[PDB]
């Protein structure tokens, strides 16, 4: 019922300080293929899941999506207290326990859980994030698909702090509803690593983030500290 993305107002967030901790199992996650969709970068995965949290049961990882802007100043989708990061990784998970496929999960408000990891541009070359920029040479055209070149552990792309905000919203392209898990703490990357994304053909792709929507009266943002 809430269109994504949003500005998260920390002063309005509801503290849920009795939740089970969030359990991330990316040890068995393996990247299958990488896509240039013409609009964004998609990395598909097999294996790996997340458990609650607020989660009624576990949700399997299916894919990763990357967003940026034309400046290292302004590129993420979600904001926190009107602060926009350089970029945003979205990790899509689906309710395989309840529904037979992703396609059936995408039609329900308890089918998709998306994890948001922010990208902060600094003077720090991320060796783990690099494993992704290297793939970019294979997928410059649109829409192209290539096998993910070599060894990569998603676990390395996790933030150093896993406190998070959560709310019921939608996919970034609005195609379906989804619950968001959003870490305020970003991972750090260099300008040289992000700029590579802007050299992908879109038919020229300088920016692909979406502006935020007003929070609806009945939309709650919960914080797990």
């Amino acid at each position, epitope marked *: 019922q809430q269109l994504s993305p949003i500005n998260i107002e920390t002063k309005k967030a509801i503290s849920n300080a009795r939740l089970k901790p969030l359990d991330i199992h990316y040890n068995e996650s393996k990247p299958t293929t990488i896509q240039n*969709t013409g*609009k964004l970068v998609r990395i598909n995965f097999k294996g790996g899941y997340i458990s609650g949290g607020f989660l009624p049961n576990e949700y399997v990882l299916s894919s990763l999506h990357i967003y940026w802007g034309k400046e290292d100043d302004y590129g993420s989708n979600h904001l926190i207290d009107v602060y926009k990061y350089s970029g945003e990784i979205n990790l899509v998970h689906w309710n395989k326990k309840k529904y037979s496929s992703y396609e059936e999960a995408k039609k329900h408000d308890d089918g998709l859980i998306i994890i948001s990891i922010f990208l902060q541009v600094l003077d720090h070359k991320n060796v783990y994030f690099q494993k992704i920029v290297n793939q970019l040479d294979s997928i410059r055209s649109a829409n192209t698909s290539a096998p993910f070149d070599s060894v990569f552990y998603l676990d390395n792309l996790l933030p150093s702090k896993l406190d998070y905000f959560t709310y019921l919203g939608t996919t970034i392209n609005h*195609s379906a509803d989804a619950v968001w898990i959003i870490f305020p703490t970003p991972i750090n990357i260099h300008s040289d690593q992000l700029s590579k994304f802007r050299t992908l053909l*879109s038919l020229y792709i300088t920016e692909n983030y979406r502006n935020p929507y*007003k929070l*609806n009266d009945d939309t709650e943002v919960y914080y797990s500290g």
Partner: antibody, heavy 119, light 107 residues
Framework: QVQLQQSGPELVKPGASVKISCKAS????????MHWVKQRPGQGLEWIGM????????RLNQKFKDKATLTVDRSSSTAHMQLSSPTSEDSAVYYC????????????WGAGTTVTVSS | QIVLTQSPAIMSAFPGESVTMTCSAS?????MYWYQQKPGSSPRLLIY???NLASGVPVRFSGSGSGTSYSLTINRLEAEDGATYYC?????????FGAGTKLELKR
């Protein structure tokens, strides 16, 4: 020029499926959501649904769930809408319109395709 | 779904007169959008984000409102403004339009 070119007037036999088309030119087709809008002689504008061209992910108005099927031909930069088992209620003008990737408005519209369902 | 009620259904005024048309929503809308459709033509953006004029829209047009109540005003009507005007919300899916205000001219 940025332009949306729609197929010509369609006479459709009741119960006989129909596909109408919307060819985009002048811009990057994959980058903008394409929407379909229905207009009946006396019934205002109705949003049928939209499709994200980059991955063909569509969202349909539940009112048109079993009626309209939204597809795209990325190679030909053409969005399609199929109407299944049409009735006289499906007679209308159908617009394709592009919404801006950043601003939530419909910045380009086709001339509309008139569909008459009648025997 | 969010239902938008447009009043009046039909109206007319002389050129130079001020015209106000309202769009009422069944629940709160973040921003209202306005489309102008001249007879025989496709709809065309007039106002976006409640009160921003689309490129080339004459300054006699203005949009206003918040919550469940919004309006479009033409300050000094001109004959070429004869059209049906639709409000539209982008707060929840499905996207919905009002049934329109048909505006015609007096002479």
């Amino acid at each position: 020029q940025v332009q949306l070119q729609q197929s010509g007037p369609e006479l459709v036999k009741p119960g006989a499926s129909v596909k109408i088309s919307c060819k985009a030119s002048g811009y990057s087709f994959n980058f903008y959501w394409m929407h379909w809008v229905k207009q009946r002689p006396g019934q205002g504008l109705e949003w049928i649904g939209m499709i994200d061209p980059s991955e063909s992910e569509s969202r349909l108005n539940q009112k048109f769930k079993d009626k309209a099927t939204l597809t795209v031909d990325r190679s030909s930069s053409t969005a399609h809408m199929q109407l299944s088992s049409p009735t006289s209620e499906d007679s209308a003008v159908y617009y394709c319109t592009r919404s801006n990737y950043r601003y939530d408005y419909f910045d380009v519209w086709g001339a509309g395709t008139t569909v008459t369902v009648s025997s | 779904q969010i239902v938008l009620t447009q009043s009046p259904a039909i109206m007319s005024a002389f050129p130079g007169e001020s015209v106000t048309m309202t769009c009422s929503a069944s629940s709160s809308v973040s921003y209202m959008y306005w489309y102008q459709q001249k007879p025989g033509s496709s709809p065309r953006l007039l106002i976006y984000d409640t009160s921003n004029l689309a490129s080339g829209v004459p300054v006699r047009f203005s949009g206003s409102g918040s919550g469940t109540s919004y309006s479009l005003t033409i300050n000094r009507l001109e004959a070429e403004d004869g059209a049906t005007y639709y409000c539209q919300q982008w707060t929840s899916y499905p996207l919905t339009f009002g049934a329109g205000t048909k505006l015609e001219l007096k002479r």
